[PDB]
């Protein structure tokens, strides 16, 4: 009852977390092709947003396909005679999520915020952590990475990677590595996540980023 | 920062999401698998050195044909995937994916990947395809297609059992180091 609703709610949250991550990386390739220019009115942005929200092809990378997967679970709840109010509540969450994405993807400022957040996630993942729990490692580092509002503007047609990846990679080794002989971080590095190494990491990442942003 | 960009292309029969989720999470069979992979990198150990393995699924739907190629710049290695239990997905390797990849990336190494290896000898799946005048793709058929498209390797894997799964990514990395 509450157990079946909790499981579908958690599955919906997994669907949305994976789809929102993917959607912004896919939209980022349109921005990359425009060398970091944001303009929700362009032909390429309008088509990218429409197709990744609304493609109806079976197996599509689209919010419409995610919605199909969620419809399977809500139908199963109704088959199991779960209270209609609890099932409707799941359906309204999904409608909320669509409405919220449809508003954000046609707002230049909301697009910038989505892309800057994904840049941050990609740069956290560039840190060469080969230890046991990479999600918990990145959760500890995340509060010490503050990216500028114009981070999206550094996506260029000619670049394989956003340049912030190299900055987090190198600063993480400088402040958290257990030795100069190890080119990577692991469980032995975790003792190096003191307030002292983390604050210094923060300051050094901010300075390397500022130097990059102000390069003539 | 040693960084590899690995791009995955293939039809919806393929299970591109399960392939990438299974490799990056080693989730137990039975766990909830989302509709799409989120295209985040994985750090992997190669000869005592960290390698950032960028893993991108592409939006395979035909209405993304015009924009899908914006995913392809600076790609180090392509995995062109088909399902071993979908002959249509296998013919789309040479009819669609190989020409599309080659249009944009003439020289980038290709690995040909057959997925759903666990179904090729599932009694109910062999029975199902039988009823439609079909047969699963055999190893030699896959090898022939790999030669036809000039793939550097042909590999077969199961997302479900992880048979062949590590080798796909190991070979993808090896193909870029050459």
UniProtKB/Swiss-Prot annotation, chain B:
InterPro entries: P-loop_NTPase (IPR027417), Small_GTP-bd (IPR005225), Small_GTPase (IPR001806), Small_GTPase_Rho (IPR003578). It is a lipid-anchor. This is Ras-related C3 botulinum toxin substrate 1. It is found in: Cell membrane; Melanosome; Cytoplasm; Cell projection, Lamellipodium. Its EC number is 3.6.5.2. Glycans are attached at residues 32, 35. Changing residue 157 to Y: In MRD48; decreased substrate adhesion-dependent cell spreading; weak dominant-negative effect. It comes from Homo sapiens (Human). Plasma membrane-associated small GTPase which cycles between active GTP-bound and inactive GDP-bound states. In its active state, binds to a variety of effector proteins to regulate cellular responses such as secretory processes, phagocytosis of apoptotic cells, epithelial cell polarization, neurons adhesion, migration and differentiation, and growth-factor induced formation of membrane ruffles. Rac1 p21/rho GDI heterodimer is the active component of the cytosolic factor sigma 1, which is involved in stimulation of the NADPH oxidase activity in macrophages. The modification (Microbial infection) O-AMP-tyrosine is found at residue 32. The modification Phosphoserine is found at residue 71. The effector region mediates interaction with DEF6.
């Amino acid at each position: 009852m509450e157990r079946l609703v909790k499981k579908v709610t958690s599955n919906l949250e997994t669907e949305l977390k994976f789809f929102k991550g993917r959607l912004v990386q896919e939209l980022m390739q349109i921005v990359k092709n425009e060398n970091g220019r944001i303009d929700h009115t362009s032909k390429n942005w309008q088509e990218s947003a429409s197709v990744l929200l609304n493609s109806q092809e079976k197996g599509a990378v689209s919010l419409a396909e995610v919605e199909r997967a969620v419809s399977k679970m809500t139908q199963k709840l109704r088959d199991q005679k779960v209270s209609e109010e609890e099932v409707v509540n799941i359906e309204s969450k999904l409608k909320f999520e669509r409405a919220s994405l449809e508003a954000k993807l046609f707002d230049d400022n909301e697009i910038k915020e989505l892309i800057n957040k994904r840049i941050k996630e990609d740069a956290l993942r560039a840190i060469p952590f080969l230890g046991s729990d990479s999600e918990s490692f990145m959760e500890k580092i995340s509060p010490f990475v503050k990216l500028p509002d114009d981070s999206y503007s550094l996506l260029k047609a000619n670049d394989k990677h956003h340049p912030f990846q190299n900055i987090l990679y190198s600063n993480a080794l400088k402040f958290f590595a257990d030795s100069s002989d190890i080119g990577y971080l692991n469980d032995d590095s975790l003792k190096n996540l003191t307030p002292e190494n983390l604050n210094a990491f923060e300051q050094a990442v901010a300075a390397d980023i500022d130097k990059l942003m102000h390069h003539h | 920062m040693q960084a590899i960009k690995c791009v995955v292309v293939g039809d919806g029969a393929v299970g591109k999401t399960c392939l990438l989720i299974s490799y990056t999470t080693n989730a137990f069979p039975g766990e909830y698998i989302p509709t799409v992979f989120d295209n985040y990198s994985a750090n992997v150990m190669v000869d005592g050195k960290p390698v950032n393995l960028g893993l991108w699924d592409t939006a395979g739907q035909e209405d993304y044909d015009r924009l899908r190629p914006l995913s392809y710049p600076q790609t180090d290695v392509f995995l062109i995937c088909f399902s071993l239990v979908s002959p249509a997905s296998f013919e789309n390797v040479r009819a669609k994916w190989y020409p599309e990849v080659r249009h944009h990336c003439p020289n980038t190494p290709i690995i040909l990947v057959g997925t759903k290896l666990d179904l090729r000898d599932d009694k109910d799946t062999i029975e199902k395809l039988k009823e439609k005048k079909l047969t699963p793709i055999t190893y030699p058929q896959g090898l022939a297609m790999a030669k036809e498209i000039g793939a550097v390797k042909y590999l077969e894997c199961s997302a479900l059992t992880q048979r062949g799964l590590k080798t796909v990514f190991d070979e993808a990395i090896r193909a870029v180091l050459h």
